[PDB]
Paper text:
[name] kinase is the founding member of the RIO family. [name] is involved in ribosome biogenesis, cell cycle progression and chromosome maintenance. Previously solved crystal structures of [name] [name] ([name]) and Rio2 (afRio2) have shown the RIO domain is a trimmed version of the ePK catalytic domain with an additional conserved N-terminal α-helix. The [name] structure consists of an N-terminal domain (N-lobe) that consists of a α-helical region and a twisted β-sheet that contains the phosphate interacting loop (P-loop) and an α-helical C-terminal region (C-lobe) that houses the catalytic and metal binding residues.
Author numbering: 3 to 85, 90 to 258
């Protein structure tokens, strides 16, 4: 319960002096997840958990210092809550549509799916965070940002985009959608200003729902992604045609 939580927080060196992190961890993570994090720490993948980056309805995201490839890396640790709507994105994906989606296994299969989508995208040259490892409902990946503060998402940039190469940023997004579709053969299926981050270039995040092109709604998901992106960049002065961008992505 609460004693079980405190021991793992102590073990993870998540201290009260660190602001509200400890109170947040203790509420958003349950005993089973904390144990998994401790397993990853004791195995040597995690050096030290840090700040809480995001708390959500499906997942929570934390900063961590860890080790991957025998080097110390800044990590984002993305954790799916052990406890619906996502199902069309799970069933109907060929890689999972003949598998046993048990209720008590479902969240773990989702985490796995995101990890495999990250590897798939990354290896096809799409800008996503380098995936490092995963265990149960825990994903360890490359931290996008510096000095423990996450790069802004596009929506967090907002008007600041007018102070940037907004057309260039748009073209970066389109090029990544095109690589995702053509080389990785995936459709993001929830692409928006809420899951594109920007440092010196764009990175796509939140790939749990991405489906291969063999998913029967894949082309519908794509056009939804493309319309979504064009409409968002329209607010910041990017003039783009749906037809042309969709053809560009698909290779027509
Ligand atoms: N996947 C992932 C990540 C999510 N986030 C954060 O959580 C928020 C929720 O999406 C987002 O607004 C961003 O602020 C990340 N931050 C740094 N590196 C990462 N790899 C991630």
């Amino acid at each position: 319960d609460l004693k079980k939580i405190e021991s793992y927080l102590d073990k993870l060196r998540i201290k009260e002096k660190d602001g509200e992190e400890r109170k947040i961890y203790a509420e958003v993570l349950d005993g089973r997840t904390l144990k998994t994090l401790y397993k990853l720490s004791a195995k040597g993948y995690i050096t030290a958990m840090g700040g809480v980056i995001s708390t959500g309805k499906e997942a929570n995201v934390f900063y961590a210092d860890g080790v991957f490839d025998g080097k110390p890396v800044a990590m984002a640790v993305k954790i799916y809550r052990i406890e619906d709507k996502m199902d069309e994105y799970l069933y109907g994906d060929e890689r999972f549509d003949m598998r046993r989606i048990s209720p008590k296994e479902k969240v773990f299969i989702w985490t796995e799916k995101e990890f495999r989508n990250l590897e798939r995208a990354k290896e096809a040259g799409v800008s996503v965070p380098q995936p490092y490892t995963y265990m149960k409902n825990v994903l360890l990946m490359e931290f996008i940002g510096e000095d423990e503060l996450p790069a802004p998402t596009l929506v967090e940039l907002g008007r600041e985009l007018k102070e940037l190469d907004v057309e260039g940023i748009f073209n970066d997004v389109v090029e990544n959608v095109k690589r995702l579709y053509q080389e990785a053969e995936l459709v993001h299926a929830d692409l928006s200003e809420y899951n594109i981050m920007y440092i010196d270039k764009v990175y796509f995040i939140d790939m749990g729902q991405a489906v291969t092109l063999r998913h029967p709604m894949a082309e519908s998901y794509l056009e939804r992604d493309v319309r979504n992106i064009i409409r968002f960049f329209s607010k910041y002065g990017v003039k783009a045609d749906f037809e042309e961008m969709l053809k560009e992505v698909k290779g027509e």
